[PDB]
Write an enzyme that holds these catalytic residues in place. Structure first.
Site, PDB file in Angstrom:
ATOM      1  N   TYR A  10      -2.374  -9.884   5.124  1.00 50.18           N
ATOM      2  CA  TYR A  10      -2.350  -8.466   5.460  1.00 50.18           C
ATOM      3  C   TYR A  10      -3.763  -8.010   5.796  1.00 50.18           C
ATOM      4  O   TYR A  10      -4.614  -7.880   4.915  1.00 50.18           O
ATOM      5  CB  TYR A  10      -1.774  -7.647   4.294  1.00 50.18           C
ATOM      6  CG  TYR A  10      -1.729  -6.152   4.538  1.00 50.18           C
ATOM      7  CD1 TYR A  10      -1.771  -5.630   5.832  1.00 50.18           C
ATOM      8  CD2 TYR A  10      -1.608  -5.255   3.472  1.00 50.18           C
ATOM      9  CE1 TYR A  10      -1.695  -4.259   6.059  1.00 50.18           C
ATOM     10  CE2 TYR A  10      -1.528  -3.880   3.694  1.00 50.18           C
ATOM     11  CZ  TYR A  10      -1.571  -3.393   4.990  1.00 50.18           C
ATOM     12  OH  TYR A  10      -1.465  -2.040   5.225  1.00 50.18           O
ATOM     13  N   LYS A  23       0.239  -9.413   8.875  1.00 59.12           N
ATOM     14  CA  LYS A  23       0.587  -8.028   9.143  1.00 59.12           C
ATOM     15  C   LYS A  23      -0.721  -7.448   9.653  1.00 59.12           C
ATOM     16  O   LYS A  23      -1.701  -7.349   8.905  1.00 59.12           O
ATOM     17  CB  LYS A  23       1.002  -7.301   7.866  1.00 59.12           C
ATOM     18  CG  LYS A  23       1.255  -5.813   8.076  1.00 59.12           C
ATOM     19  CD  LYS A  23       1.486  -5.085   6.745  1.00 59.12           C
ATOM     20  CE  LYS A  23       1.705  -3.591   6.967  1.00 59.12           C
ATOM     21  NZ  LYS A  23       1.690  -2.814   5.691  1.00 59.12           N
ATOM     22  N   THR A  82       0.838  -1.196   0.000  1.00 61.78           N
ATOM     23  CA  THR A  82       0.000   0.000   0.000  1.00 61.78           C
ATOM     24  C   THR A  82       0.874   1.248   0.000  1.00 61.78           C
ATOM     25  O   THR A  82       0.605   2.219  -0.713  1.00 61.78           O
ATOM     26  CB  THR A  82      -0.898   0.042   1.247  1.00 61.78           C
ATOM     27  OG1 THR A  82      -1.616  -1.190   1.353  1.00 61.78           O
ATOM     28  CG2 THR A  82      -1.886   1.195   1.157  1.00 61.78           C
ATOM     29  N   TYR A 131     -12.920  -3.878  -0.797  1.00 63.54           N
ATOM     30  CA  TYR A 131     -14.093  -3.481  -1.569  1.00 63.54           C
ATOM     31  C   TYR A 131     -15.223  -4.481  -1.833  1.00 63.54           C
ATOM     32  O   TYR A 131     -16.393  -4.132  -1.633  1.00 63.54           O
ATOM     33  CB  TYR A 131     -13.629  -2.888  -2.901  1.00 63.54           C
ATOM     34  CG  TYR A 131     -14.740  -2.298  -3.740  1.00 63.54           C
ATOM     35  CD1 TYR A 131     -15.299  -1.061  -3.425  1.00 63.54           C
ATOM     36  CD2 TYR A 131     -15.221  -2.972  -4.858  1.00 63.54           C
ATOM     37  CE1 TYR A 131     -16.310  -0.504  -4.207  1.00 63.54           C
ATOM     38  CE2 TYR A 131     -16.234  -2.424  -5.650  1.00 63.54           C
ATOM     39  CZ  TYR A 131     -16.770  -1.189  -5.318  1.00 63.54           C
ATOM     40  OH  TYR A 131     -17.743  -0.631  -6.114  1.00 63.54           O
ATOM     41  N   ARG A 146      -8.994  -0.003   5.565  1.00 66.00           N
ATOM     42  CA  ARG A 146      -8.834   0.213   4.128  1.00 66.00           C
ATOM     43  C   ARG A 146      -9.636  -0.784   3.293  1.00 66.00           C
ATOM     44  O   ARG A 146     -10.243  -0.414   2.286  1.00 66.00           O
ATOM     45  CB  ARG A 146      -7.362   0.110   3.727  1.00 66.00           C
ATOM     46  CG  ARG A 146      -6.513   1.312   4.118  1.00 66.00           C
ATOM     47  CD  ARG A 146      -5.057   1.092   3.715  1.00 66.00           C
ATOM     48  NE  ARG A 146      -4.218   2.246   4.028  1.00 66.00           N
ATOM     49  CZ  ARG A 146      -4.157   3.356   3.297  1.00 66.00           C
ATOM     50  NH1 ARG A 146      -4.886   3.474   2.192  1.00 66.00           N
ATOM     51  NH2 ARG A 146      -3.368   4.352   3.679  1.00 66.00           N
ATOM     52  N   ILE A 176       5.962  -4.161  10.022  1.00 64.67           N
ATOM     53  CA  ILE A 176       6.114  -3.838   8.610  1.00 64.67           C
ATOM     54  C   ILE A 176       5.762  -2.362   8.726  1.00 64.67           C
ATOM     55  O   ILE A 176       4.592  -1.978   8.783  1.00 64.67           O
ATOM     56  CB  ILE A 176       5.134  -4.619   7.719  1.00 64.67           C
ATOM     57  CG1 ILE A 176       5.573  -6.091   7.672  1.00 64.67           C
ATOM     58  CG2 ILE A 176       5.139  -4.040   6.309  1.00 64.67           C
ATOM     59  CD1 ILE A 176       4.736  -6.984   6.774  1.00 64.67           C
TER      60      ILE A 176
END
Lengths: 294, 294, 293, 293
Positions: A132, A161, A43, A106, A137, A203
């Site tokens: 992740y 993560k 990202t 999404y 997000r 990370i």
């Protein structure tokens, strides 16, 4: 095995194209500053605006440049399973040490959908995979039940993560998935508390500009010296906050530009910071006495 | 100064009245199990359904029966400033060691209103005051800016019980407020990470049931031995979770009943657990090999 | 843009887009009075369709429609350059409009959202419908940004609002032109939004009960909310069941039961849990729908 | 319960309830067509009034109104025993109804919520209105629980809903009887809620513009949403500013500007930030209201 200080590397741009000479120097920057691994095309690396081909070129390039001196993790996921399999296969093919696969954003798949997604990719490509999770997000979250089922069925799925403010979730993962699984902090400000609970590293975004300091925070925590960890954490707190004054990676890429590590160029929908915010950032970097080139 | 293992004590009832025989035994329970302080009339003590009079009586009962053998903190807040001043003055008069004042619930005052609320109480009563922030119940949050101003202006506003899942807020408080301010965890499952960031202890729900184990967790953290803290944390995780299977203090009071420390009696709107959840609670307590009497 | 618009599913058959099924879907809506067909939207599994499939589906819808029904193309994404190209193609093949979703996942700043839509709008002279759905994109385009965008770009004429905030609907209707059009992005909220001034809906329920939904819209547009309520509460159960699992899982499954497409999704989407699919079936039978599967 | 109901502020003067000011407020609403007055609600600062003042205010209101306008008494809290007694007092002194808020802060389970309202309803034979406002109580009474309560207790007849979820309103309207009444608990949502079947509003805004709000409700009750919309949008700026700060800080300040009460709150409530008070003044001036202070 995925542990320590890992940097979510920005992707330098120039003339509307990936700036490979800057990327190369960024890689050397981390090799000589103690960073344990580099995550490319994540990202923070603006993967949303990178073409599928730029993704494979950057990954292939990073592996060649790093050349085993530091681990290279490739961001290979999206919200389409078939596509994630192909990109993860590529990462495997070109020598990446691991693949970071984001929870589909999404389209909000069901937990069964999330299971089949990661299972499909893991069983298809024999490469270490890091889940992740970043609900803020993706707008969906992979449950610990699903993670448990995944880590149990695929020896291939070894870490996650976690960009979540819920320490309880970290406790649940550490307790249920066991020692062979590794939890990595997905937020600089939460690395200390997460590692106090058993996380094995981070990370990081802040790693892009102060690699040495972040590394020190991580080693103190790994050593169990939280008095020292707190010292570094609170010293770096101002940096951790300003890097998110605007949507990441807008601030961090801007900071790297100020340090002369890349061109001040993003790809829409991302844009330069507001003058007011950009000045706040510059002032923070100066308080840390960082050698600004721009 | 306020630190260590503090119990948010339940308020036992019998025949629709406060059960002082049970309350007295509870005090003895914590005196010989090493608890650092007893908080009476907090949320866990069902302050909402206790009359102003019962509040006054429980506080004096706790202080006198404790007879100086253990610190006593009085829950004296509400969402009306005038009465908070009155009850806090009472706690002071009867010898309470401190007063826990919750952030006004339901009427959602502005930050200026929160400032004036706490400043008024603190200036009127010379007793150490602990701010109690729990947004999930009060539906409003006292900002760190407001806390900083209060702590700066009022020498007796010395701590905050933070029942928040936001570790970043904890970092902000520790960093901005003096070393002379104390942050206490308001969530048992969050004590380890909060203390790793600098919190000084916990105002716990779980130590109502396992005071020795919880204090051991606190001791390890204070000593900086997070390897040992983690062992205790994960050992107690099932307990920390089951105590919130239903709205606190429904499960913890039920747990105290099973241990034979009080009657299985609540005041409406609070109710006994559902038969199913109660059985699940019992199963967890048996797992910890607790001496159940009921 | 107004009336009953259908967020069409994208039929799949053994790994590829099922054009015969899609073709029947188009005639299905031409025959039932639907006002417009939106292809390649979230409901159409845009996330798992390649770029080539998008342009292919868009052109197929326009050419097979042949002016018999308005066609809206879903052409947005979270990368401005790509959105420009796909929107240009929609314009190129003759779509009547382009639905451009607010960038998902990368959470652009409001300035970024402004530049994103402005760029697409100024590059392609096609009517554009902004698609705001924070529950999926994890970011929301502010009314200030929408006002600025609609004020500067003559072709940014509408917004599909999948939001439960009626106050936002009021602010948009009040602040933007009477000309600007707010389309409901949630079947369950169509009535209240239209009472507030919305011009119609880009529906999911439209995929299975086109006539009834069209009826709801007509009553609302006529100002007969007594009748709109009657239809609203009648279809309530349908509206709810269609979201028992993430959309479009339920609606595509429903279309399958109605014999309108194969029961095939593209991962990460999956078939419904057997118990939820049973629930869907019971609801459909309650509306006395002619199930074939 | 229906129409235009005002969540009346409670005037204070020298640290005491200002009964002269309260009486004048009551006459104000009788004179301007308000259907009912709710005393000792959130807007009336019930949190800082003593149990004694609650009793006094309710008795005073009923005696003053004397049937010229309905009087609803806010009698709930988060302690069941206490709510029973205060509600009993309301019936005793002649209140037409009692508004009982969902317990705040202690987050009872749905069973506790059921027992709370059932106990109050069965002990006192007075019409009861449930007040659901999750943003303040930090818990929500489920429609299931509401259904069980309304079915069991004939006197639980309505709910004041301060929620932005129109789907919840649809669910309540459809599941509970035709007898049960849903009242908007938010001025800006009255129109959409009424379009869905709500019967009125327990408003903050009608404290200052009783006539205009009444017209909005009448238009909605008549099914004329074109007219409801023009009034809704006309009053939007007012609806908005009255919540620029926690209610009732703005509305009581507005009342003071109108010369209807002293500028006095009870801590923890305080006067508005200077800049916000000025913004409020500007808005009231835009409506050409007769400001005295």
């Amino acid at each position: 095995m995925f542990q320590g200080s890992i940097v979510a590397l920005i992707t330098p741009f120039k003339e509307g194209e990936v700036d490979y000479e800057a990327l190369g120097n960024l890689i050397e920057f981390h090799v000589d500053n103690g960073t344990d691994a580099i995550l490319v095309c994540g990202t923070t690396g603006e993967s949303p605006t990178l073409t599928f081909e730029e993704h494979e070129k950057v990954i292939e390039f990073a592996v060649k440049r790093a050349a085993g001196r530091i681990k290279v993790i490739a961001g290979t996921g999206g919200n389409a399973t078939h596509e994630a399999v192909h990109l993860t296969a590529h990462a495997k093919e070109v020598g990446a040490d691991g693949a970071l696969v984001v929870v589909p954003y999404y389209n909000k798949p069901t937990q069964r959908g999330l299971y089949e997604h990661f299972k499909t990719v893991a069983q298809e490509v024999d490469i270490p995979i890091i889940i992740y999770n970043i609900p803020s997000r993706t707008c969906v979250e992979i449950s610990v039940d699903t993670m448990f089922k995944l880590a149990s069925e695929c020896e291939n799925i070894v870490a996650s993560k976690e960009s979540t403010p819920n320490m309880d979730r970290i406790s649940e993962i550490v307790k249920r998935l066991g020692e062979s699984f590794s939890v990595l902090s997905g937020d600089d400000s939460l690395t200390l508390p997460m590692m106090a609970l058993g996380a094995k590293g981070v990370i990081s975004v802040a790693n892009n500009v102060m690699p040495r300091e972040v590394k020190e925070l991580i080693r103190a925590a790994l050593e169990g010296d939280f008095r020292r960890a707190r010292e570094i954490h609170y010293y770096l707190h101002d940096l951790f906050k300003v890097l998110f004054i605007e949507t990441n990676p807008i601030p961090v890429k801007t900071a790297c530009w100020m340090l002369g590590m890349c061109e001040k160029e993003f790809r829409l929908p991302l844009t330069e910071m507001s003058p007011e915010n950009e000045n706040k950032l510059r002032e923070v970097l100066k308080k840390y006495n960082l050698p600004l080139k721009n």
